[PDB]
A paper describes a structure:
In the apo crystals, the two fold axis is crystallographic. The apo structure is locally less ordered than the substrate bound structures, lacking density for residues 97–100 and for four residues at the C-terminus compared to the + NAG structure, which just misses one residue at the C-terminus. The domain swapped dimers superimpose less well with the RMSD for the apo dimer vs + NAG of 2.81 Å over 241 CA atoms as a consequence of flexibility in the positioning of the pseudo monomers within the dimer. The NZ of K178 in the apo structure forms hydrogen bonds to both the main chain and side chain carbonyls of N173, whereas in the liganded structures this side chain is pointing in to solvent. The region 176–178 lies away from the sugar binding site, so the change is not a direct result of ligand binding.
However, a dormant state in Firmicutes can be recapitulated in the laboratory. This paper describes the first structure of a group of peptidoglycan cleaving enzymes from Firmicutes, called stationary phase survival proteins (Sps), that are involved in survival in the stationary phase and are analogous to the resuscitation promoting factors (Rpfs) from Actinobacteria. In all the structures, the final two helices and the last strand of the beta barrel of each half are supplied by the other chain in the dimer.
Numbering used by the authors:
A (entry chain A), B (entry chain A): 73 to 96, 101 to 214
């Protein structure tokens, strides 16, 4: 894999705060959907389109981003300032495939009856004794 | 945090293959957008809606899923069979916030000129000497 095939430490290194983003009054069929600042469409490929602060990484900058891939600075955003990098992903499934835990043990707290209603799910979410943990999830 | 507040190993444990999914001929304003098999809308909260094979985890099953949270089996899918769990996330940004690496060193391979075109990005993606690595990314 790329992380090991090349000797990246021979290149200048910079630290960033990394986030993820995807495309999308625009819908996936519209001609302007997915267009980056630079004019190219978002792309995940050998060279993927990423967003940066152009005063730190100019448009056209090529970066190697470990466990993501080569990135080309193609996009910007008003919230993308300083040593900030927004990594493009096509879908939620793709980002979990690349960073989430696939092999997972889970615990069975209560077996279902076969049905659940909005009222029942709300009453679970409102559980008085668990509200201290809810802030994290909601 | 929940992972440590309760003694989960006192509950039955099962292994799954975990993936991520999100909502969405439907668009976010449509009344039927985001509806799960069970009839409830997808939700990320103290109790989040997840998808399973109902012959393994019936609808209404409550699971504790480490580093995700409590899940209620609310959804199904033709591809969700066996010991398979699909974890709901609202957005790509959320799944990277929860599983991606935020504190990241990146390497500067080439500084940009300020512009990049579709043709130029394509020529990068077509780089003959790097095609062996491309299968992974595309």
């Amino acid at each position: 894999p790329l992380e090991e095939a090349f000797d990246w430490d021979e290149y200048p290194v910079q630290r960033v705060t990394a986030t993820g983003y995807t495309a999308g009054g625009k819908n996936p069929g519209d001609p302007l959907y997915g267009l980056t600042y630079s004019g190219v469409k978002v792309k995940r490929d050998l060279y993927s389109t990423v967003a940066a602060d152009p005063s730190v990484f100019p448009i056209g900058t090529i970066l190697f981003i470990p466990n993501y891939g080569l990135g080309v600075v193609a996009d910007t955003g008003s919230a993308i300032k300083g040593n900030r990098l927004d990594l493009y992903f096509e879908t939620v499934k793709d980002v979990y495939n690349e960073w989430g835990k696939k092999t997972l043990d889970v615990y069975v707290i209560k077996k279902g009856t076969g049905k659940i209603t909005e009222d029942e799910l709300e009453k679970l979410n409102e559980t008085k004794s668990l509200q201290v943990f809810r802030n994290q999830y909601k």
